[PDB]
Write an enzyme that holds these catalytic residues in place. Structure first.
Site, PDB file in Angstrom:
ATOM      1  N   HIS A   1       0.814  -1.221   0.000  1.00  0.00           N
ATOM      2  CA  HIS A   1       0.000   0.000   0.000  1.00  0.00           C
ATOM      3  C   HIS A   1       0.852   1.277   0.000  1.00  0.00           C
ATOM      4  O   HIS A   1       0.309   2.377  -0.138  1.00  0.00           O
ATOM      5  CB  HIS A   1      -1.027  -0.011   1.130  1.00  0.00           C
ATOM      6  CG  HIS A   1      -0.472   0.304   2.483  1.00  0.00           C
ATOM      7  ND1 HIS A   1      -0.360   1.590   2.954  1.00  0.00           N
ATOM      8  CD2 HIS A   1      -0.063  -0.504   3.490  1.00  0.00           C
ATOM      9  CE1 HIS A   1       0.110   1.564   4.188  1.00  0.00           C
ATOM     10  NE2 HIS A   1       0.308   0.305   4.535  1.00  0.00           N
TER      11      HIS A   1
ATOM     12  N   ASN B   1      16.670  12.760  11.917  1.00  0.00           N
ATOM     13  CA  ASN B   1      15.760  13.858  11.616  1.00  0.00           C
ATOM     14  C   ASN B   1      15.559  13.920  10.109  1.00  0.00           C
ATOM     15  O   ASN B   1      16.479  14.268   9.382  1.00  0.00           O
ATOM     16  CB  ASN B   1      16.281  15.188  12.154  1.00  0.00           C
ATOM     17  CG  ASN B   1      15.236  16.286  12.072  1.00  0.00           C
ATOM     18  OD1 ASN B   1      14.551  16.431  11.053  1.00  0.00           O
ATOM     19  ND2 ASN B   1      15.090  17.048  13.150  1.00  0.00           N
TER      20      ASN B   1
ATOM     21  N   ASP C   1       0.204  -7.657   1.920  1.00  0.00           N
ATOM     22  CA  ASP C   1       0.649  -6.262   1.898  1.00  0.00           C
ATOM     23  C   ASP C   1       2.166  -6.173   2.026  1.00  0.00           C
ATOM     24  O   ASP C   1       2.706  -5.839   3.085  1.00  0.00           O
ATOM     25  CB  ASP C   1      -0.052  -5.467   2.995  1.00  0.00           C
ATOM     26  CG  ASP C   1       0.159  -3.975   2.872  1.00  0.00           C
ATOM     27  OD1 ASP C   1       0.660  -3.502   1.827  1.00  0.00           O
ATOM     28  OD2 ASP C   1      -0.196  -3.264   3.842  1.00  0.00           O
TER      29      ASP C   1
ATOM     30  N   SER D   1       1.574   1.750  16.196  1.00  0.00           N
ATOM     31  CA  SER D   1       2.041   2.423  14.988  1.00  0.00           C
ATOM     32  C   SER D   1       0.872   3.228  14.425  1.00  0.00           C
ATOM     33  O   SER D   1      -0.284   2.972  14.768  1.00  0.00           O
ATOM     34  CB  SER D   1       2.537   1.410  13.957  1.00  0.00           C
ATOM     35  OG  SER D   1       1.553   0.431  13.695  1.00  0.00           O
TER      36      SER D   1
ATOM     37  N   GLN E   1      -0.318   6.594  11.192  1.00  0.00           N
ATOM     38  CA  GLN E   1      -0.149   7.123   9.838  1.00  0.00           C
ATOM     39  C   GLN E   1       1.281   7.591   9.626  1.00  0.00           C
ATOM     40  O   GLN E   1       1.816   8.322  10.449  1.00  0.00           O
ATOM     41  CB  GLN E   1      -1.101   8.292   9.575  1.00  0.00           C
ATOM     42  CG  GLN E   1      -2.573   7.925   9.616  1.00  0.00           C
ATOM     43  CD  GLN E   1      -3.239   8.232  10.946  1.00  0.00           C
ATOM     44  OE1 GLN E   1      -3.923   7.379  11.514  1.00  0.00           O
ATOM     45  NE2 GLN E   1      -3.047   9.456  11.450  1.00  0.00           N
ATOM     46  N   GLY E   2       1.890   7.167   8.522  1.00  0.00           N
ATOM     47  CA  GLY E   2       3.272   7.528   8.215  1.00  0.00           C
ATOM     48  C   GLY E   2       4.274   6.471   8.639  1.00  0.00           C
ATOM     49  O   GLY E   2       5.420   6.511   8.204  1.00  0.00           O
TER      50      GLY E   2
ATOM     51  N   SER F   1       3.525   3.309   8.052  1.00  0.00           N
ATOM     52  CA  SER F   1       3.254   2.326   7.014  1.00  0.00           C
ATOM     53  C   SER F   1       4.512   1.865   6.315  1.00  0.00           C
ATOM     54  O   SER F   1       5.347   2.685   5.934  1.00  0.00           O
ATOM     55  CB  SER F   1       2.348   2.936   5.949  1.00  0.00           C
ATOM     56  OG  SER F   1       1.041   3.113   6.436  1.00  0.00           O
ATOM     57  N   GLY F   2       4.628   0.553   6.133  1.00  0.00           N
ATOM     58  CA  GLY F   2       5.739  -0.033   5.406  1.00  0.00           C
ATOM     59  C   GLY F   2       6.965  -0.291   6.257  1.00  0.00           C
ATOM     60  O   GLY F   2       7.887  -0.963   5.811  1.00  0.00           O
TER      61      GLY F   2
HETATM   62  N1  LIG Z   1      -1.399   0.748  12.951  1.00  0.00           N
HETATM   63  C1  LIG Z   1      -1.784   1.369  11.691  1.00  0.00           C
HETATM   64  C2  LIG Z   1      -0.538   1.906  10.985  1.00  0.00           C
HETATM   65  C3  LIG Z   1      -0.665   1.866   9.465  1.00  0.00           C
HETATM   66  C4  LIG Z   1      -1.505   3.010   8.916  1.00  0.00           C
HETATM   67  C5  LIG Z   1      -2.914   2.995   9.501  1.00  0.00           C
HETATM   68  C6  LIG Z   1      -2.959   3.540  10.920  1.00  0.00           C
HETATM   69  C7  LIG Z   1      -2.831   2.449  11.983  1.00  0.00           C
HETATM   70 CA   LIG Z   2      18.311  13.651   7.938  1.00  0.00          CA
END
Ligand SMILES: NC1CCCCCC1
Ligand SMILES: [Ca+2]
Length: 223
Positions: free
Chosen positions: A40, A54, A84, A172, A174-175, A177-178
């Site tokens: 995704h 950073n 996925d 975890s 948003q962001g 992911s992966g």
């Molecule tokens: N644990 C999930 C992380 C992936 C993106 C959706 C938000 C929640």
């Molecule tokens: Ca950096």
């Protein structure tokens, strides 16, 4: 990452940031020229950023390398998120060192109760939005298949596992992911999905990497 801690610069040397003008996903370096991420996370124009802490500042240990190709799993279903997983090849091999290092693929699947490290540059709020610019970490246990299926009736396949806390507060988001879920020095999971972040009885769901080792090895060997 919600409810986590600041990892420390370059303490997670296999963690990569996928950048298309901006950070949009995590990934894991599995050898000098290949990254594992979520299907995704697929898009064109990916630059892989290694050695990051950073992500908004050039701090001196980064390597920026464009992807030459991406390979989404042939059985990936974007509706159910089954399978996925995606491989990304770097245009040139990364220079491996103490701060940029590959993570081993599993030889066996990790069991419920195994403690793992989940990391990323995703949202740190379960309701608000706040993006950290430094890498965040979370220690979390793999949950039983039964509790995972009970949390998400009708949605957990044999290619997924839950990790985290049924009480909520740590997850975890948003962001992330992966990104990696590493347990005992092996990549066991990929940040895949969940219902919101850090919500009670809605733990994070992760791609079960041990099911894909043959595919990963064979794909790398011919691409
Ligand atoms: N644990 C999930 C992380 C992936 C993106 C959706 C938000 C929640
Ligand atoms: Ca950096």
């Amino acid at each position: 990452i919600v409810g986590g801690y600041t990892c420390g610069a370059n303490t997670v040397p296999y963690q990569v940031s996928l950048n298309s003008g901006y950070h949009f996903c995590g990934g894991s370096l599995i050898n000098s020229q290949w990254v594992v991420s979520a299907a995704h996370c697929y898009k064109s124009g990916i630059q892989v950023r290694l050695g990051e802490d950073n992500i908004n500042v050039v701090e001196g240990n980064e390597q920026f390398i464009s992807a030459s190709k991406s390979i989404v799993h042939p059985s990936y279903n974007s509706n159910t998120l089954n399978n996925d997983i995606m491989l990304i090849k770097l245009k040139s091999a990364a220079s491996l060192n103490s701060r940029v290092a590959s993570i081993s693929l599993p030889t066996s699947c990790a069991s419920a109760g195994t403690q793992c490290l989940i990391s990323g540059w995703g949202n740190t709020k379960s309701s608000g939005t706040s993006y950290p610019d430094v890498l965040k970490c979370l220690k979390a246990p793999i949950l039983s298949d039964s509790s995972c299926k009970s949390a998400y009736p009708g949605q957990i396949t044999s290619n997924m596992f839950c990790a985290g806390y049924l009480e909520g507060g740590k997850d975890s988001c948003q962001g992330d992911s992966g990104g990696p879920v590493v347990c005992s020095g092996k990549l066991q999971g990929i940040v895949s999905w969940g219902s919101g972040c850090a919500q009670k009885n809605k733990p994070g769901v992760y791609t079960k990497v041990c099911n894909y080792v043959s595919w990963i090895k064979q794909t790398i060997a011919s691409n």
